[model samples]
Target: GSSGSSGRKDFTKEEVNYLFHGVKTMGNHWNSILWSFPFQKGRRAVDLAHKYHRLISGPSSG
Candidate 1:
């Protein structure tokens, strides 16, 4: 049995970058690559996605 996608530790650096890039490059099209990743269904992925979403929206862009 695999550790499964639900676990955050299951993600490698490359995969995380894909998450970052997926949302960054794909725009609304991000969902396709988003769901295809190893995250748990639409749950954890959304959490992280929203987190990163705000990072780019944050006030420290200087």
Candidate 2:
């Protein structure tokens, strides 16, 4: 059996851009260490999601 989870967040274009910028900045360092992390793309996406989620949800859980 497989387990799964799903969630969604609303974001502005500007916020999305900032999220990606942050992920790219972080990924630069991540990639420097381990270039084979498959979740790197997902890391960027999730980072963006969490960032905007924090802004909207007010920094309790990420």
Candidate 3:
């Protein structure tokens, strides 16, 4: 069963842009990024790191 927003992997365009910006500034330092800004409430540093991986490695453009 789906557990709503907290359990999903979805991210908004704002979050996407913020993630990219944080990575550019911090260079994979997900913990620093979290402290620097408030990401999605339930998201952990690991999730952000993996998200960065997907965004950079997949077809998400430059």
Candidate 4:
């Protein structure tokens, strides 16, 4: 079976709020935090939840 992955889920209100919180917490440096490698990917954040993950998140385990 080809278990190809699907697309990302839409953020809930709470999730959106959390994301905004990240943005705010980073202050004017948000882009530095946001565009850094891991966060740039866009899926890792959803899979691992923000609190457990790093600011720049990086690549997969393998």
Per-prediction RMSD in angstroms?
8.6, 10.8, 7.5, 11.5
lDDT of 1 at 47: 59
Residue 22, model 4: lDDT of 61
For the record, the alpha-carbon RMSD of candidate 4 to the native fold, in angstroms, is 11.5
Task: Write down the TM-score of every candidate.
Answer: 0.38, 0.30, 0.70, 0.31
lDDT of each: 0.57, 0.45, 0.73, 0.43
Residue range 1-62, candidate 3, lDDT tens digits: 21224346677766777887888878888888877876789778888888777665755365
Residue 27 accuracy (lDDT) in model 1:
68
Off by over 4 Å in 4: 1-8, 27-43, 46-62
Q: After superposing candidate 1, which stretches have Cα over 4 Å from the reference?
A: 1-15, 41-45, 58-62
| Model 2 quality (TM-score) | 0.30
lDDT: the better of candidates 3 and 4: 3
Output the lDDT of residue 11, model 3: 73
Query: Of the candidates numbered 1 and 4, which has the greater lDDT value?
Result: 1
2 or 4: which has the higher TM-score?
Answer: 4
Error of 4 at 14 (Å): 0.4
How well is each residue in 1-62 modelled by candidate 2, as lDDT tens digits? 31223245444454445444555666534333223323333355445455545655643475
How do the residues 6-59 of candidate 4 rate in per-residue lDDT, one tens digit apiece?
A: 256543444444455665666434444445323434555344344324324444
Model 3 RMSD, rounded to 1 decimal: 7.5
TM-score of 3: 0.70
Order the numbered candidates by lDDT, best leading.
3, 1, 2, 4
